[PDB]
Amino acid sequence: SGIQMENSWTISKEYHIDEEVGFALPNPQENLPDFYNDWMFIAKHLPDLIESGQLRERVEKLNMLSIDHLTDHKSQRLARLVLGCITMAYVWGKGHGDVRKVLPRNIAVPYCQLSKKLELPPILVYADCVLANWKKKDPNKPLTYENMDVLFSFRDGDCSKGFFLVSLLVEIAAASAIKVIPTVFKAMQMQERDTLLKALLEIASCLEKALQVFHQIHDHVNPKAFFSVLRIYLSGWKGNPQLSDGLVYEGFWEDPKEFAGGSAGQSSVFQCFDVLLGIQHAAQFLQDMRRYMPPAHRNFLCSLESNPSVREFVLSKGDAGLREAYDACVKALVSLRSYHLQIVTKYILIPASQ
Ligand SMILES: CC(C)(C)c1ccc(S(=O)(=O)N2C[C@H]3C[C@H]4C[C@H](C4(C)C)[C@@]3(COC(=O)Nc3ccc(I)cc3)C2)cc1
């Protein structure tokens, strides 16, 4: 394959894709070294600090903390999540138009240095607030909504736990499809009909499960709270009239810089299975959001594109079962796309109408 392999069964660890949670970060770090307690206090108290109007003054009194004591990937990912949440809270405040156009240097410099190390933009992205923003309540119990929590929220009542955790559980459901991908390509190389069929049916089954998990969003997110509260903190400064030149990262760049806020295009799940199934100004935007995924996940998506076409293989075999299994995967992925559009309508377009 174009996919680098660790062994005959498992893809390379260099893709940072976990067998159990997929593109999500496995067992995220929850605590930083004591050195960073001042950052953690602010992030853990964002709801009451934003609500009381205390957040900005608190950030402005922070001392400068070097990033050199964040020595491994998980601590760096946690620090990025912490600093990114503080940054969105600092820029947008309570979300009433009182924006800050300069991010103070004692956040901007460490945030930007950590972002450079991880090759992610210095703005909150999906890999922060969903893929790394979670824990198990009971380590001995499975990955279920009842047994999990987020690490950070923005405002009390913003429904961030529901929005982030349901998204994460969709990613985890997709993980059981991602781990079958090498089997698909081995089965094509070996001309193993049943192996390919069972792989495609498993992928379909897991993507169908992912849609069923996605349906839970309605039980844990209120449309008005999402649109009027949470959406503020997922908004960016690229083409935004409130920050028309972007944000000044004090002490890192002289001039303001534009970075985009959140997009569903930041989940690698869509492109992963679009490419696998051959069903790939919107192209430019799509590729830009790819640069907001972790670089290892970009590399996985690129390796997938270098592989033979599953679609053309299946459609050449005169094999109803293979085609039905392939069609079941296409249907499942299209249903995820359609549901995303339904969520955009109910949680953004309609509330905006009001
Ligand atoms: C407000 C905003 C435009 C960012 C958005 C709108 C609708 C949806 S969603 O509910 O349609 N859906 C959840 C996720 C569930 C399914 C559909 C994909 C999925 C395959 C995993 C979703 C991916 O989620 C995200 O990429 N989330 C995200 C991205 C950046 C940030 I910073 C924070 C969160 C999409 C998600 C986000």
UniProtKB/Swiss-Prot annotation:
Record organism: Homo sapiens
Highest taxon listed in the record's lineage: Eukaryota
Database matches in InterPro entries: Indolamine_dOase (IPR000898), Trp/Indoleamine_2_3_dOase-like (IPR037217)
Catalytic activity: D-tryptophan + O2 = N-formyl-D-kynurenine; L-tryptophan + O2 = N-formyl-L-kynurenine
Any one Pfam family match given in the protein's UniProt record, by short name: IDO
Transmembrane segments: none
One Gene Ontology CC term in the entry: cytosol
Cofactor binding mode and count: Binds 1 heme group per subunit. In the active form, the heme iron is in its ferrous state Fe(+2). The catalytic cycle does not alter the oxidation state of the heme, but IDO1 is prone to autoxidation.
Record-given protein name: Indoleamine 2,3-dioxygenase 1
Assembly notes: Monomer.
